[model samples]
Every structure is written in structure tokens, then in C-alpha cells.
Target: KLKVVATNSIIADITKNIAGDKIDLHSIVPIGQDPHEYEPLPEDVKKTSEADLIFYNGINLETGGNAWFTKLVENAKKTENKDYFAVSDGVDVIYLEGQNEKGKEDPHAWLNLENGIIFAKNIAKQLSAKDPNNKEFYEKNLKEYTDKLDKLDKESKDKFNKIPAEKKLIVTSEGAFKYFSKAYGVPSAYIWEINTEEEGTPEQIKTLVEKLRQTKVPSLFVESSVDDRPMKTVSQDTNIPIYAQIFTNSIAEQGKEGDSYYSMMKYNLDKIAEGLAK
Candidate 1:
């Protein structure tokens, strides 16, 4: 059996599409917590230590300091190689600015369908290399999943294209959708660059409110993981109703609307359409 550990359920779902039944997957972060700040349990550490392959979002999603995932391997006394890596290895990363003096790498790359393609390919390549006997299977799965991803990407692009250029701007509590905004050609503003930054009526929040008032967006939004109060204040000031919470930072619960990558992407697109198409 191939033992694998993924840092979050969103990545785990992407891995599952490529891995199939070939691997036993574990997620290091608990459900409903931000991977950026969540403390791992000893069990999470131990499981990651034991896994034959470990996958994480590399562009500083979890603790943007050292390669903490590699450090997890060090604690487990394992050598890193194909044995440990990031699913975001081949992705074109996006960056955020002006939220803080310390610029942040937009870690939510998986939110983009094209980047998700890279993630699937990297996962398929890594797993195939780690277990050559199943290379054919992994490649077959990759082709199928990538096809689905392509369809999702094109369909979303077409749908978002219908949103008037004037309404194409998205406003959220945190700038988690930078990659998504860039991918779909929709610009975004938020209360903060990342969730870890200062929020709630700070300068960031005030600026977001001003932008919303200037842009005249029909609605505002908050991510599911962050406090909605800041965005709510923006909404109250501008009288723009918040449509609904989006699951950008993490996947929704199992059997829920945003549980899978495609589902989550589609859910956000639909919500955005509702907010912008009005």
C-alpha cells in the first residue's frame, strides 16, 4: 500500500483524482482550520513522518518561512526526494502587494483551473515515479482528470465572460482569490492580503470599503474561514449586500457543495456570477 499525506483536503482531493485506490491519503490540517495558522497534532506529524510520499501546497501556504514540510520529514528522520515534494511545483505563482510591507505569495494557486492542471500533472508524475509499476494507471487517471479540468476552465471562462466588464471586479475579506482573479481576468480587492494579516476596520478594511464604494460592486463577499465582520462593515457602509461565503482557503465538508475541486471552483464561479451579473 502507498501511504501518502497531504496538507489539506483540497490538495487531498486533487491527489485522490490522480492516486485512485493506489494510496492511503492523510490530511495534516484539521477540517475547518486555516493551514496558514493551524497547529498540527502529534498524529499529523507522525503520519507525515511515516508516509511514502508527502504532498503540500509549496508557495508558502503553510508558514511562509522555512520549508516546514521538509522539516516535517526531518522530524521523521527521512530523506527527501520523490518521497517529499509540493503539488504546486510546476505552477505559475501569483503575488499580492500593498496589504503589508512583507509581500505575500498568493498560496491559493489551486483555485485556478490551469494551476490545478499543473497540480494534477505533478501529482501523477510524482506518484508514477514513486511506483513505476502503476505508471500507466496514474497517467490514464491524469488524462481523464485533466480533461475534466479543461472543460471546467473553458466553461467558467465563458460564463465569467458574460459578466459585464464593469461588474467583473470581485471584493472579498481576504485577497485569497488573486490567482482566480488573474485566471478569469477579473480583478479583486479585499480587506487584507492574506488571512494572517491584520484585519477588521484596520487600514486594509477602510481601503476595501473605499474601493467597493468607488467600484459600486452590487455585492460583497467573505471567505468561509475568516471572520465576516470586516466585510460586513464594508457592506453596511456601501449598502452592498454580501451574497454568500466562498470556500477559497479550504474545501467544504464532505458531501457538501464545495467538497471537490471542480465543485468548489464551480460554486465560486456561480456565486460570483450572481454577485456580478446583477
Candidate 2:
């Protein structure tokens, strides 16, 4: 089996759908861990060193200032476009809108199901490159997985479109939905532009509060990985309620409802509809 490593569980789950048992897959970042600043473990180093290929979310998800993934690959003597690659390669990237990391890639492109197709395609392509014998198997799995993804993508658009235009607002802790919002033709706002050392600042809270005041969005949401307290405060000030906890940086725990990529995306769409369409 080809030894493969994915930077985070979300990527791991997506790759698993396409690669299945043909590859010995390992996920570096565990469930509930943030990929943005995840510290690599000794086991992670070993896995990377022996990996036939690696897949990362990229667009700076792992290559940000923390550069944890880069260091691990460097230590393993792995080179990009050879030993490892980003699943986000073909995505039409969306840049961060805030001044904090102005013009940086949002790195959450997978949240958009269409972009997820690109991720799977890149994974299948790379897997085929490394292990030609399993090309048909990989292609078969990729088709089945992407067909399901296409179904969910269409359903998500129709579901969100039913909501009144004024109520179609998504407020969360981080601005991780630039691509998601664009894909669904909705809009989103957040307390922080991206995950970093700084979080839940007073200025951020104040700014989001004022935006909610004008927008009067129906409800607020918190990502499973972020501190909900900041959004809690925003909820109180705006007299709105926190609706649901959605997955972003990582999938849910094993054996959980949102554990897999498909399940997580379905969970998010259903929860978002429940909140915004009310």
C-alpha cells in the first residue's frame, strides 16, 4: 500500500472517499484540532518521512506563518509537487478581506462543495501518479464520491435559496465562509478574519456587533473549534441567539454524525438552513 498522509482530518476523510483501502492513509491533525497552528508530533514526522504522497488543504492552511506542515515536510526531505501537494490546487482562490491578513487565501475552500470536487480530483490524480496499478480503483471511488457531492451541492443551493434574502446571513467566529457564501449566493460575517494568535479582541467584537445591529441577522453560529464566548457576547449585545455549532477546521469525532466529509457538509447545511430559514 502507498503510505499517504493528509494534514487534517477533513482532508483525510475526503481522500479516504477517493483512495479507500488502496493507500495506507494517515491524518496528521486529529479530530477537533485546528490545522492552522497544529504542532506536529514525532509520529507525524515518521509518517511524513515514509509517506509515498501527502495532501494538505494549502492556500496557507498549513503554510501560514506557523509553517508547521512545511517544517515537517522539510525535515522529512519531502518536496512540494513531488512528495506532497495541496488539494486546493485548482480552486479559484478567495482572498481574505480584512486588513489583518489582507489578500491572503481563505484556506477553507473545501467548505464549498464544488471546490471539494477539485480536492478529490487532485487526490485521485496524485494517487494515480504514485500508484498506477490502483488507478481504476481510485477513479471508481472518486466518481461515486463526487456524484454524491454533486447531489449535496445542488440540495444546499436550493435549501439556502428558499430563505428570504434579508435572512440569508451567516455570522460565525472566523470568516471561513468566503467561498461557501459565494457558492450559495449568501453573505457571511465573523469576529476575526482568520484564525491566529489573536482572537476575540474587543475591537473585533465591537465591529461584529455593529454589523449585526444593522443586518439584524436571525442567529449566530460558532465553529466547533473556536471559542464561542466571543460570539456569545455578540449574541447578547445584538439580542440574537446562538443557533448551532458548525464544523469548519476539523470534522467531528469518530463514530459521530459529522465525522466524515460528506456527513459534516450535510450537517452544516441542515443546521444553517434551520437557523437562517426560520
Candidate 3:
């Protein structure tokens, strides 16, 4: 059996649907755990060393930093038997020109359903290539998964269209929702560019508050993985209720509804729809 190690929960969840019983899967990070700042335990290294195939979201979205992934890749390079693939290969990457860290693109491409489809396709391709015997299985799974993703894209578009054009403003703690905003034609502003950075300064908060006051948006949303202090402050100052949207920067805790990618996306959509409807 192929020993597969997935670096993030979202990738692991999708891969599990494809690989099924054909592979032994290990996910490096648990649900609701922030991948960006996740520090791998010693056991994680062991799992990486033993895996026959390793998959990562790439685009340096891992909170452990690019250096960690670089080291893993370098180690995999010296091992002739291990296969490593980046799921973000073919997707159109949205580079946050002013907000992102130097040399880093927004790595949240999967937030867009179309890009998520690409990610699923890449996984299928790699799985088939690694285990040619399972090519048919992978292909069939890919077709089904991609079809659902396409439907999701359309559904999201339809739901977003219901929001008035003037109310399509999304204010959040960080720039993580750029792909979602871009896909749905919503304009978004964030207090910070990078997730690892500090919350917005007083002036920064002031600017966001001003925007919120001017727009009088129905609600302000914050991600589950981020500190809500900044967002709360914005809401308090503007007298708007803050809604917590599950972006799943980390894996959800066990038994939680947002533990899986599908559920997480649905939860986010629900929150957005509710906020817009209000």
C-alpha cells in the first residue's frame, strides 16, 4: 500500500476521497489547526520520512514557513523512492501586490471553487502517476469531485449575486479572503496583509472603522483562526455586530461541523449569505 502524507487537512480530506482504501494516509496538521504557524512535532518528521508520496498545498501557505517545506523538499530530493507534489501547480495564483509578504502570493487559492477544482485534478493526476494501477479509480474519483466543485462554484456565484452591488464590501482581519472576494466580485479590505503579522495599529483600525462607518455594512466578519480582538474593536467602535466566519486556516477540532473542507466552505458561505441577507 502507498504511504501518503498530506501536509494540510483540506488536501488530506480530498485525497482520502480519491485514495480510499488503496493508500495509508497521514495528515500533518489536524482540523482547525492553523497551517501557517503550525510547528511540526518530531513525529511529523518521522511520518514525512516514511511516506512514499507527500503532498503540500505549496505557495508557502504553510504557517511553519517556506523554509520548513524547503527542507522537506530537499530531504525528499535525496531520497530516490519518495514522491513530492504541490497541489497548487496549475491554478491561477492571485498575487497580492501590495498586501502580501515580499515574494509570496496569497496562497489561499483554494478559497475559489474553480481553483479548488484544479487542486483536486492535480491530486488525481499525481495519484495516478504514482500508482499507475489505480489510474482508473483516480480518474473516476476526479471526475466526480470536479463535477461537484463546478456545481459549488455556480452555487456560490448565484448566492453572491443576491447581495446588492453596493453592499459587497468585506472587511476582515487579514487578506485571506482575497480569492473569495475576487471570485464573487466583492471588494474586501483587511487590517493586515499577512496572517502571521500583528493586528492593525490604531491608525490602521481607525481607517477600517472609517470605512465601516461610511459603508454601514450589515455586518463585519472575522475568521475562526484569527484573533478577534481587532475585529471586535472595529465592531464596537462602529456599533456593528461581528460575525465569525470559518475560513479553516487550521483544522477544526474533532466533532466540529467545520472539520472538513466541504463543511468548512459551506459554513463560510452560510455566514456570508446570512450577513448579506441581514
Candidate 4:
């Protein structure tokens, strides 16, 4: 069997759907863990060192001052664009705004189901290149996976289209929904731009509060992977309750409702639809 290692559970799930029964897949960051600050372990290193192929979400998702993912690939003596690759290679990336984060990639392209098709295609191509004998198998699975994604893409848009324009705003703790908001035509506000250490700052909260007070939004939302207290405080200040907790950086644990990427995306759309229409 082909050995494959992905940077996070979300990527691992996508890989599994396409490479089913043919590859031994391992996710470096466990389910329900944060990928932005992941510190690879000895076992992760071992897995990378022995893998036939390594996949990661690039656009600086795993590279920064720490650059743990880069270090892991290097330690394994793997060559870039060959043994290891970024599944987000061709994604039309969105950059972080403001002076400090200018030109920084958002790293959450998978939030958009359309961009997810790109991820699936890239994974299929790379996997085929690595193991040509299983090319047909990977392509067949890719078709099935992308077809499901296309159905969800249209369904999510149709649902969002029916929602009232004023109720289309999405408020959350982190600005992780830029891709989703753009794809689904919903506007969003958040306490922070990303899940960093300096979260829930007084200024951040104040800005969101002011934005909420100006907009007639239905409710706020908190991601399952991040701290909900900040959004809770926002809800208290704006008198807008937190409608629901959504997934972003990670999928639900095994056997859970949103454990797979497909279910997770559908769950988010359903929850958003319910919250906005209420």
C-alpha cells in the first residue's frame, strides 16, 4: 500500500475519500487540533520520513517563524514538488488585510467548496504521479468526491439565496470565513483576523461590537476549534446571542456528525441557514 501523510485531519479526510483502500494515511495534527500552531512529534517525524508522499495546506498555513512543517519535510530528506506538495497549489488565494499582515495568505481556502474541488483535483494528480498503477482508482474516486462537492456547492448557494439580505451577515470570533463568505455571498465580521495568541483583545472586541451595533444581524457564531468566550462577550455586549458553533480549522472527532469534510461543510451551511432564517 502507498504511504501518505497529511498535515491536518481536514486534508487527511479529503485524501482518504480519493485514495481509499490503496493508501496508508496519517494526519500529523490529530482531529480537533489547531494546525496553525501544530508542533510535530517524534511519531509524526517517523511517519513523514517513511511516507511515499506528504500533503499539506500551503500558502503559509504551515510555514512561519516556527515553520514546523518545512522542518518536518526537510528532516525526512524529501524533495519539494516531488515527494511532498501543497494541496492548495493552484488556489486563488486571499490575502490578510492591514499593515502587519499585508500580502499574507489566509490559509483557509478549503472553507469554500469550490476551492475544495481544486484541492481534490490537486491531490488526485499528485497521487497519480506518485503511484501510476492506481491512477484509475484515484481518478474514479475524485469524480465521486467532486460530484458530491458540486451538489453541496449548489445547495448551499440556493439556501443562502433564499435568506433575507439583511440577515446574511455572519459574525464570528475569527475571520476564517472570508473564502466562504465570498463564495456564498455573505458578509462577515470577526473579533480577530486569525486564531493567534493575542485573541479577544479589548480593541478587537470593541470593533466587532461597534460593527454589530450598526448592522441588524441575527446572531453571532463561534468556531468549534477556538475559544467561544470572546464571541460570548460580543453576544452580551450586542444583545445578539451566539446562534451556533461552527467548524473551521478542524473536523469533528471520529464517528461524529461532521467528522468528514463533506458532512462538515453541509453541517455549516445547514446551521447558517437555520441561524439566519430565524
- lDDT for each of the candidates? 0.80, 0.88, 0.76, 0.89
For all candidates, the clash counts are: 0, 0, 10, 0
Instruction: Give lDDT for model 2.
Output: 0.88
- Looking at model 3, residue 20 earns an lDDT score of 80
Mind sharing the TM-score for model 1?
A: 0.92
Cα error of candidate 2 at position 1, Å: 0.8
lDDT of 1 by residue, 154-208 (tens): 9888988987787778888877888888899889877776644456656776787
TM-score each candidate.
0.92, 0.95, 0.91, 0.96
By TM-score, the candidates rank as: 4, 2, 1, 3
Off by over 4 Å in 1: 65-70, 98-104
Off by over 4 Å in 2: 98-103, 195-197
**Candidate 4 wrong stretches, greater than 4 Å:** 98-103
Name the better of 2 and 3 by lDDT. Answer: 2
Clash pairs of candidate 4? none
RMSD in angstroms between candidate 4 and the native structure over all alpha carbons: 1.7
The candidate maximizing TM-score is: 4
At residue 112, give the lDDT of candidate 3.
Answer: 75
Error of 2 at 143 (Å): 0.6
